[PDB]
Design an enzyme around this catalytic site. Structure first.
Site, PDB file in Angstrom:
ATOM      1  N   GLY A 305     -36.235  13.756 -20.075  1.00 21.63           N
ATOM      2  CA  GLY A 305     -37.164  14.751 -20.577  1.00 21.63           C
ATOM      3  C   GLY A 305     -37.060  16.045 -19.804  1.00 21.63           C
ATOM      4  N   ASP A 346     -39.968  12.232 -18.796  1.00 19.86           N
ATOM      5  CA  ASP A 346     -40.284  13.489 -18.153  1.00 19.86           C
ATOM      6  C   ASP A 346     -40.839  14.483 -19.155  1.00 19.86           C
ATOM      7  N   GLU A 348     -43.260  17.123 -20.429  1.00 21.49           N
ATOM      8  CA  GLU A 348     -43.814  18.107 -19.535  1.00 21.49           C
ATOM      9  C   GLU A 348     -44.928  18.948 -20.123  1.00 21.49           C
ATOM     10  N   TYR A 423     -44.721  21.492  -6.346  1.00 21.59           N
ATOM     11  CA  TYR A 423     -43.884  22.574  -5.865  1.00 21.59           C
ATOM     12  C   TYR A 423     -43.749  23.694  -6.883  1.00 21.59           C
TER      13      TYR A 423
END
Lengths: 631, 146
Positions: A305, A346, A348, A423
């Site tokens: 993903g 993944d 998002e 991050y």
């Protein structure tokens, strides 16, 4: 395990039960032995490991990163005479170098010399460096089983693959590319408990790279009849580059034997299985073999993903049968590579975000929940419980969209784990002000912590308190690159927008290892800013950074000390688990520090390298929050 | 010295004459990934000429790779009838013949008929059934052989 001893003596007549210790002035004490050293007439014991920058003065109820360098003031003036009492000091980098740190690269020097690169330590002649990871040293100590602590993991990606400087190259960035051999970790395996290869993808994806999707789908569809196997439509998962994954020998810890690197998308397909698996992925399988040769089996994993390939998530939503076929391809992959401990997804953007190519609707989050449940169901239908897989997804910390993620139902639908992206909060090229792209901790004045000052702790508390989710089900980590920003003013956090910023390969995203090469050092047993580049730290958010005045260039970055802070917090929490994003470009010092933050203990008196001196803070400052400054 | 049986080098077949005869450029337009797999040949090529063409005529120009002996036949289907925007098309093939002849393969660009063959053309003889040395030898030292 490591072991150490000391001794003390008295007159034959006198026996203290306590460890008597010579009364003396403080001066650069260190280690584990008892110290009652004296300073400013006070008398000080660090009842914890001692470090050359730690100071008893501040230490009176401080002096270590966690608690009091406790004291008494029993000393009389004539004691303060027989011993010359200290009252101030400053530890310096030693003159010698107790350990090598890295090795130069011919080709990276050549790179700097290149008339386009023109790279310089100050970056004046060249804002980018494209420095080869080969510069790096192994840099991994060794550690005890320490079974109780939460799991450790690291991310891994295809950018390990190539740097044509190994082949001369010299004309284009990838010829000046990056990459490393997993042999590195193989040297001392079990460095982590789990690993995650980068998000791969599926047929029908929409983003820029989709020509790759096309090519591989073509190769697949060509092979399939010849294999006597059914054709595939959209949603079928892609390997992206089997030639990299398997048609490789260099950088993959394996002899060139049998590396039929000629094979590719149009031909690999028979080989698309662990038994047959050459190259990278196979190497990983053998790495796990070595690991088990020791014991403590790694959770080998990957996901799909992610940031740049999520585009089709919305498209696949509400196409239930295609979603079914997709997860069928998932479990097929499991069958093809039963080696895997698990693999994940993944996604998002439940609400749209990131790259705009990720077309999205509102219902996306709900539909995503639904399909997620359906995935879980499919997995359980496939798997034997003795070998069951349990799934995780990351999260973005977008205060609202994270809510839109319906974690409650995902948990209720057996999504077992969450990994918080911790991050790049500082969208440095576009962000309004300089800030710490990865601050765990809330700075003062949380009044503006909505698109800024994004202390992950806030989301953490949302899930724990505002969503009741056990820490077990959530995981956090760190990344091995900072941000870099032009023209920033330390007082205002205002900075030169748009102005190009430092990166070896990625402007604005300074790369840790090369920072160690260029801007920071430790060769003299210390955290050491170097080449005229400022070492610095903010008290407001426990922030840590670097600066350079001639271009007002700032860098926000994690550090050994700062990831230590992180791991210690997570540990005190007893989070579900710890990891590092972009693990591909740390020597491993940050991993050793991470073990330390986990409280994960070394198993021998020997070392690959020290780590204590890496925890001195930088140039102290107080930086006002964005709200504080604007107010 | 003395030697061994004749042995197939079981890898990429080797070089033979290219017979370049393209219309709009030299042989250097061409690129060729000669290789092999599982006792059968595999190869991949590209000819960088398409963008030059006046597709008014050169539309759907035959682009590809095809074996041609004295019959110079067209028993192949990899022909990419290039679009006016196939500026860099990749052609890709494999072959399966017992006869390890150093077969010539015409490749590149051609129209189905008419002298127009806009772009690179080559008639590459491959070479196949290659071998390798194994260098072991007597030596003389003074009168005494070793």
């Amino acid at each position: 395990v490591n072991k150490y001893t000391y001794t003390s003596s008295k007159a034959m007549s006198d026996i203290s039960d306590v460890i008597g210790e010579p009364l003396a002035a403080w001066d650069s004490q260190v280690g584990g032995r008892v110290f009652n050293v004296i300073f400013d007439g006070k008398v000080y014991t660090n009842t914890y490991w001692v470090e050359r920058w730690q100071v008893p003065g501040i230490g009176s109820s401080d002096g270590n990163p966690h608690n009091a360098w406790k004291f008494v003031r029993a000393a009389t003036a004539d004691e303060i005479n027989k011993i010359g009492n200290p009252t101030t000091a400053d530890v310096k980098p030693t003159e010698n170098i107790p350990s090598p740190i890295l090795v130069e690269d011919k080709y990276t020097e050549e790179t700097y010399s290149r008339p386009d690169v023109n790279f310089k330590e100050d970056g004046s002649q060249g804002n980018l460096s494209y420095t080869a990871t080969r510069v790096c040293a192994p840099m991994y100590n060794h550690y005890v089983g320490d079974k109780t602590k939460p799991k450790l993991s690291a991310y891994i990606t295809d950018w390990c693959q190539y740097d044509a400087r190994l082949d001369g190259g010299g004309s284009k960035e990838e010829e000046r590319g990056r990459g490393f051999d997993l042999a590195t970790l193989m040297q001392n395996p079990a460095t982590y408990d789990r690993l995650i290869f980068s998000f791969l993808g599926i047929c029908g994806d929409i983003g820029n790279k989709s020509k790759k999707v096309q090519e591989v789908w073509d190769g697949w569809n060509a092979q399939a009849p010849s294999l006597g196997l059914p054709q595939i439509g959209k949603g079928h998962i892609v390997p992206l580059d089997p030639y990299g994954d398997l048609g490789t020998a260099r950088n993959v810890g394996l002899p060139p034997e049998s590396a039929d690197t000629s094979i590719e998308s149009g031909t690999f397909l028979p080989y698309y299985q662990q038994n047959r698996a050459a190259g990278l992925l196979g190497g990983l399988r053998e790495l796990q073999k070595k690991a088990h040769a020791m014991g403590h089996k790694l959770d080998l994993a990957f996901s799909i993903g992610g940031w740049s390939l999520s585009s089709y998530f919305s498209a696949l939503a509400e196409n239930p049968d295609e979603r079914r076929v997709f997860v069928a391809s998932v479990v097929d992959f499991f069958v093809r590579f039963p080696m895997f401990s698990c693999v994940d997804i993944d996604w998002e953007y439940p609400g749209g975000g990131g790259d705009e190519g990720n077309i999205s609707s509102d219902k996306d989050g709900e539909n995503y929940v639904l399909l997620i449940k359906e995935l879980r169901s499919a997995l359980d239908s496939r798997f034997g419980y003795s070998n069951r897989k349990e799934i995780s997804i990351a999260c973005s910390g977008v205060k609202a969209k994270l809510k839109k993620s319906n974690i409650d139902q995902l948990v209720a639908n057996g999504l077992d784990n969450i990994y918080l992206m911790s991050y790049d909060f500082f969208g440095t090229i576009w962000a309004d002000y300089i800030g710490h792209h990865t601050n765990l901790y809330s700075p003062k004045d949380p009044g503006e912590q909505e698109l800024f000052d994004l202390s992950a702790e806030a989301a953490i508390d949302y899930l724990h308190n505002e969503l009741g989710i056990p820490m077990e089900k959530i995981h956090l980590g760190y990344a091995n690159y900072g941000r870099s920003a032009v023209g920033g003013d330390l007082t205002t956090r205002q900075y030169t927008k748009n102005g190009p910023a430092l990166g070896t390969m990625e402007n604005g995203a300074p790369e840790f290892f090369d920072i160690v090469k260029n801007y920071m050092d430790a060769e003299h047993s210390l955290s050491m800013g170097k080449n005229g580049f400022v070492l610095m730290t903010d008290t407001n958010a426990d922030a840590d950074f670097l600066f350079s005045e001639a271009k007002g260039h700032f860098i926000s970055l994690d550090t050994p000390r700062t990831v230590k802070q992180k791991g210690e917090y997570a540990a005190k929490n007893k989070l579900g688990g710890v990891f590092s994003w972009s693990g591909d470009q740390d020597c491993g010092l940050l991993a050793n520090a991470a073990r330390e933050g986990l409280g994960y203990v070394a198993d021998s008196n020997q070392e690959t390298i020290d780590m204590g001196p890496l925890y001195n803070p930088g140039k102290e400052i107080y930086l006002k929050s964005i709200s504080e400054i604007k107010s | 010295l003395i030697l061994y049986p004749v042995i197939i080098n079981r890898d990429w077949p080797i070089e033979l004459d290219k017979t370049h005869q393209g219309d709009f450029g030299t042989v250097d337009d061409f690129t060729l990934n000669s290789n092999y797999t599982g006792d059968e040949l595999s190869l991949y090529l590209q000819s960088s000429s398409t963008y030059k063409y006046d597709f008014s005529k050169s539309k759907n120009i035959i682009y590809g790779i095809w074996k041609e002996d004295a019959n110079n036949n067209r028993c192949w289907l990899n022909y990419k009838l290039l679009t006016p925007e196939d500026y860099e098309p990749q052609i890709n093939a494999t072959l399966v013949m017992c006869d390890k002849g150093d077969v010539n393969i015409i490749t590149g660009f051609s129209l189905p008929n008419g002298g127009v063959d806009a772009g690179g053309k080559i008639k590459v003889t491959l070479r196949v059934g290659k071998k390798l040395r194994d260098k072991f030898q007597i030596k003389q030292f003074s009168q005494t052989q070793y």
